[PDB]
Design a protein around this ligand. Sequence first.
Ligand SMILES: O=C(O)CNC(=O)C(=O)O
Ligand SMILES: [Cl-]
Ligand code: NI
Length: 365
Amino acid sequence: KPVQNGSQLFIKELRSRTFPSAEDVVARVPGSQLTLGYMEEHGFTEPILVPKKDGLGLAVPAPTFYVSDVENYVGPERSVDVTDVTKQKDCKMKLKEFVDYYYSTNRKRVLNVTNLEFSDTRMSSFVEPPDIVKKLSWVENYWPDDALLAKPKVTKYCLICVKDSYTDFHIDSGGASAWYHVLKGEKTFYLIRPASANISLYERWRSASNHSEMFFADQVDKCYKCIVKQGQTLFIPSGWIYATLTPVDCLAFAGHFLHSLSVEMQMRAYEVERRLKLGSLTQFPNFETACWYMGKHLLEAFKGSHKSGKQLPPHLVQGAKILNGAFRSWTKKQALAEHEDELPEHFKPSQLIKDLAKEIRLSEN
Ligand SMILES: O=C(O)CNC(=O)C(=O)O
Ligand SMILES: [Cl-]
Ligand code: NI
């Protein structure tokens, strides 16, 4: 008999499986050591676990900040996406209704809130992303504060999961990288490397009518188990395919960001998303716009490289080429209609592409 992902049975089985430890792949790093230098030296190609907040410049509430508080600072009448884990189906309800379910006994259902972005609430002031995320983030660095398009609202999520909840394998929208901090409880991540065949396997699995009856990790070479405990912060690189299990009631904060070390993976994940035609529910809003602003940054970085005769690092040049190809793809007569909606004001894509192409040729000398 086919077992639904997320079902009691499925979790009992999952808890019994053995996985390779993330000892192999996930670096343990002191907060004050997670610098742009470390990132640039290692390339952010593997998840990073920071055991203690110290040095991250991460601001989060004391661990004595409960779901009941979330209800207060966010708003009990706030509409929120609740995931029914057993049905692996979603629905909407007032926060107050979820929080009421959360505190009941005996809980019949297994429900999660994993899409609750609170940067537009009073609770926003209680959480500040780590310094390294602010340094890496495209939006943070290159999106003008007076822009007419709203910044992507993906920087502050509150995740509330009950014991025995399960989030199925996925790549985060836009191939965005993530910071994920467990305030209370713990979270188990099953991490899959975004090797080319793994990505291809994921796309095929994710679009099969029966994907919620198939355990994706059975299809890959290695699925690493990483347990993130209370107070620890996990950073997930671009493109990683992953799932989570919640062994005890968990409260966590997370944020998503794009950056210059994974321009290719970001575009490839985006392209995968495009084809899957999934719900905009989790999509990375104005992903294209972020890329546009990055493209203008690169142009300026190139022009600035001429005043000093100093080259731009190879990853930026390659990045520029990938972005430029995207820009061209997005501004094709036919395509302009769909993608113009994310074009920043006062942008002339033609001159941008031309100027970038030219400036890439020059660096290719
Ligand atoms: O909290 C969970 O278990 C699931 N969270 C995510 O997959 C995420 O924040 O992108
Ligand atoms: Cl970003
Ligand atoms: Ni996710």
